Amino acid sequence: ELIEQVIEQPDSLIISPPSYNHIQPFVYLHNVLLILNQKITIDLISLWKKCEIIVCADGGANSLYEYFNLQRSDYIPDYIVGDFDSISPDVKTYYESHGSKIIRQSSQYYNDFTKSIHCIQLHYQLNHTKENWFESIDEVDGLAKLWNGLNNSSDVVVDIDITIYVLNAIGGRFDQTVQSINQLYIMNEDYPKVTVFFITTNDIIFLLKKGVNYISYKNRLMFHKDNGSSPTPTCGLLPLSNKTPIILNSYGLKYDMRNWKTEMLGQVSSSNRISGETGFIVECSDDIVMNIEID
Template sequence: MEEVIENPDRIEIEVTDVTNVIKPFKFTKDTSKSSLTILNQSIENIDIHEIWNNTTLHICADGGANRLYEYGGDKRSEFIPDFIVGDLDSITDEVKDYYKKQGTKIIPQLSQYASDFMKSMSLILLYFNGVEIVDVDEYDGLSKLMNQLNDKHLVNINSYILNGLGGRFDQSIHSINQIHILNQQYPTLKNVFINEQDIVFMIPKGRNLIGYNSISDFYKGNKFPVIGLLPFSPCIISSWGLKWDVRNWKSSMNGKVSSSNGIVSTNGVIIECDEDLVVNIER
């Protein structure tokens, strides 16, 4: 039976029988295998210092290099990416020459059968799983190297992506579609989109804990941060730790969707679902 439970503005939940733990705010202090990808959208209103300093691999997807170059200003030497990858139809010659002189490795990938975002994700998977990235064919060399991952036990990677869900609506939907595909093919790659307003990520079917130390770690407002649970396909959701918790709640894009809910638990949120969900949390 479906049920909706309204909670006080602050509660503590019991964390039991969790099958998957997701820590979307770990970039505040991440010592694991972690990456930051900068896409070709404005980052001028995002403070990237903390996430840059707490990630070990830095990638610009084509025109994302222009955005980083502009962001850095007279301190751009503090933000030198390890790689620039893509079809390179957006990056300017000035930016390309600057980063090349600073030691950035530039990897042209001219194929139009993958987005620059997906080319970046391939690079991340190859890099952290020990596949040597040298003499890469400029058309689709990264895609070909991905075949080498079939025989490997893939490591856990925290992948943070600046923006990617702003700009054109079709590009935002495509990005969501791609993290869904990546989650199914490479579940050890944990992707988190970081925008000016919120953080967006995917949780797999099962009983998931969205973990954090304190709400104040990621939200400075007076009430509670907004959360949305967006289904890819019809699913049944139960939650613990939201302002309006649900039990056995049927959700779909042509039915009910839990948007504008709130996080009230001080020690994490549990989401149980029988299909993958996209989650957005207000920063």
């Protein structure tokens, strides 16, 4: 079998575009903003303005509220969903009194993240026709059932491009972090036209799709404040799925890989860097998570 190679490249390279997946993770610097329960440390307003719909997952509402501790009243989430065991009474009242669509789901088998995603998927299927499509659903798992029902009735338009920016889904309770990644892989397998970006305090996390991927951006300066001790943005390729091992070929990373097999309990490329000034290429034998540091 081919030699697993790692090529140390110069700090800067120009990679020409490659039949392939084109990812533009930094365009933000059908858009949906999903807010989970963690203190918001990014330029919320800037992202918000680029999104068509904003959804708060239970406690995410508190996070949005507290962000204003700008007029808090100018940023009302379209939907607030979950079992509501974290959202605070005052916050809940506040947004309810401002028109946020409340979807309480008491199911102990789906978390607020999943319930919110279902709400988002159902929104792009039923909202344009019925603004209050959510009001009469089952209180336990109506979102789960309804999304399942629509597919059973063939009433689902599988042809709609959605980009979901998720805040506060990574970095908190570890099981929540892993569940989010799990759903990232699952959603791509089930709904390939939905692109998910987890934007955290330290980086942006997305999925590289089986095959050739071309990640582009104007330049690295848009997401990596000019260094001097850091001529390159940090990144990683994380094989967190049940498909192992994954073969990687990269062009444009500081430590470029050629037929390099990656898997947990094996070698994992972390602390890699981006040398491509305008983009880089990653070919993978199966879906794999990639994180790029932002600062």
